[PDB]
């Protein structure tokens, strides 16, 4: 007994997963995965653009029915919502100007201005480990503002999902002066185990339907073919 229409919230400032084209249409791997799952679930879907920090509150308030927005599956979030099976892996990594000495350490970052998406796992990590100890962690409503402040020289660095930074910024016109600063930062507590569709905990049938559709599109190679549009590596992980 699925609803006729499933409302999916997403933060469209995370190319190549979720963004808007020049005419305002939603594009990216998350959008492809969502549309493909909806097709297989035989439901209509409405995409809803939202600031990232509003997605979980909107889901709990029933203003949307699902989140597909590179939403990392973390222990903390499991206390509040449910998740589909893994959509893809997502590690975090710092970016800074090319030639910057910056590393993802307190010693390197103390007093420096570091941008993070408000509501993100990166904000949680940076707040607990960096802000408490004297890094100027600045939290933003969306990632476009982060990249804008970085290129304006207002930020020294920014922490976000690695593949989004690489494919959506470093390899794009705006990010040519920038590069990764240090290696990815893996931390089981903060960063979770890949991303998934966020769902209300009581929506057991909707979860089962998303899980079934995801399995199905992985089984028949649709996942790999869609992924190949964006990535020359195994985005799913393990
Ligand atoms: N994957 C991270 C960061 C992110 C998701 N969407 C945009 N940024 C999170 O779930 O918090």
């Amino acid at each position: 007994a699925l609803p006729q229409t499933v409302r999916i919230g997403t933060d469209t400032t995370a190319a190549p997963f979720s963004s808007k084209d020049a005419k305002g249409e939603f594009i990216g791997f998350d959008i492809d995965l969502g549309n493909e799952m909806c097709k297989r679930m035989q439901v209509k879907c409405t995409w809803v653009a939202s600031d990232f920090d509003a997605l979980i509150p909107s889901l709990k308030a029933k203003k949307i029915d699902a989140i597909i927005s590179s939403l990392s599956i973390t222990d903390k979030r499991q206390q509040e919502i449910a998740f589909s099976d893994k959509l893809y892996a997502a590690d975090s990594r710092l970016i800074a100007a090319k030639g910057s000495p910056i590393q993802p350490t307190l010693e390197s970052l103390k007093g420096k201005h570091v941008g993070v998406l408000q509501g993100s796992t990166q904000e949680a990590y940076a707040n607990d480990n960096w802000r408490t100890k004297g890094v100027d962690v600045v939290a933003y409503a969306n990632q476009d503002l982060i990249y804008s402040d970085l290129t304006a020289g207002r930020l020294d660095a920014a922490l976000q999902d690695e593949v989004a930074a690489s494919e959506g910024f470093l390899k794009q016109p705006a990010g040519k002066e920038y590069a990764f600063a240090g290696p990815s930062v893996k931390d089981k507590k903060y960063f979770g185990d890949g991303t998934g569709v966020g769902l209300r905990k009581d929506d057991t049938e909707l979860k089962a339907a998303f899980d079934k559709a995801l399995t199905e599109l992985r089984q028949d190679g649709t996942y790999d073919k869609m992924a190949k549009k964006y990535f020359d590596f195994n985005v799913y992980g393990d």
Side-chain angles (χ1 to χ4, degrees), residues 1-3 5-24 26-43 45-75 77-79 81-106 108-187 190-204 206-227 229-231 233-237:
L2 304 176
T5 300
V6 173
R7 296 171 45 68
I8 312 183
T10 192
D11 165 13
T12 57
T13 63
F17 297 104
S18 182
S19 66
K20 286 183 177 315
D21 70 14
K23 56 186 182 301
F26 296 74
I27 54 166
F29 192 49
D30 274 355
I31 312 304
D32 293 342
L33 285 167
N35 285 334
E36 183 67 20
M37 287 185 290
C38 293
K39 178 184 172 183
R40 292 172 188 250
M41 296 158 67
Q42 304 175 17
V43 299
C45 288
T46 299
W47 288 97
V48 179
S50 171
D51 284 353
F52 188 79
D53 72 343
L55 287 170
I56 290 175
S58 289
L59 177 69
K60 294 162 64 183
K62 298 184 63 181
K63 293 180 180 169
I64 56 181
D65 303 311
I67 300 164
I68 307 181
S69 199
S70 303
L71 188 72
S72 293
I73 308 170
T74 68
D75 191 16
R77 285 169 179 169
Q78 294 265 36
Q79 308 316 305
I81 62 167
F83 289 89
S84 73
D85 293 329
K86 182 173 74 165
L87 293 170
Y88 49 82
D91 298 315
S92 299
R93 199 163 177 187
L94 202 67
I95 61 175
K98 279 165 173 288
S100 162
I102 286 172
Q103 294 290 325
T105 69
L106 181 58
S108 174
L109 291 177
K110 194 182 173 182
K112 293 193 179 197
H113 313 289
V114 181
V116 292
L117 178 67
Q118 191 161 72
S120 67
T121 54
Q122 293 86 12
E123 187 195 19
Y125 182 89
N127 279 358
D128 289 354
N129 292 296
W130 292 346
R131 172 172 159 87
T132 54
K133 310 304 181 188
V135 181
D136 182 32
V137 175
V138 183
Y140 287 80
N142 71 63
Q143 182 81 32
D144 281 354
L145 290 163
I146 296 173
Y147 291 137
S148 178
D149 269 7
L150 184 67
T151 66
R154 300 190 180 126
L155 294 171
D156 297 299
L159 186 69
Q160 57 282 307
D161 290 341
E162 181 176 1
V163 176
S166 177
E167 301 292 339
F169 181 69
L170 299 180
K171 299 172 69 173
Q172 296 303 320
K176 300 292 177 173
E177 296 166 273
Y178 295 82
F180 285 128
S184 321
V185 179
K186 285 174 100 71
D187 198 326
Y190 285 96
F191 295 124
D193 188 13
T195 69
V197 183
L199 299 165
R200 291 180 285 278
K201 294 190 196 187
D202 53 290
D203 274 346
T204 298
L206 187 54
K207 175 177 155 58
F210 271 115
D211 286 341
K212 177 173 184 287
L214 175 57
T215 283
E216 286 167 356
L217 68 87
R218 287 184 66 228
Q219 290 172 326
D220 68 14
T222 299
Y223 185 102
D224 297 316
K225 303 303 174 179
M226 295 195 302
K229 303 194 300 179
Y230 306 102
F231 318 112
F233 59 91
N234 178 23
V235 71
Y236 182 83

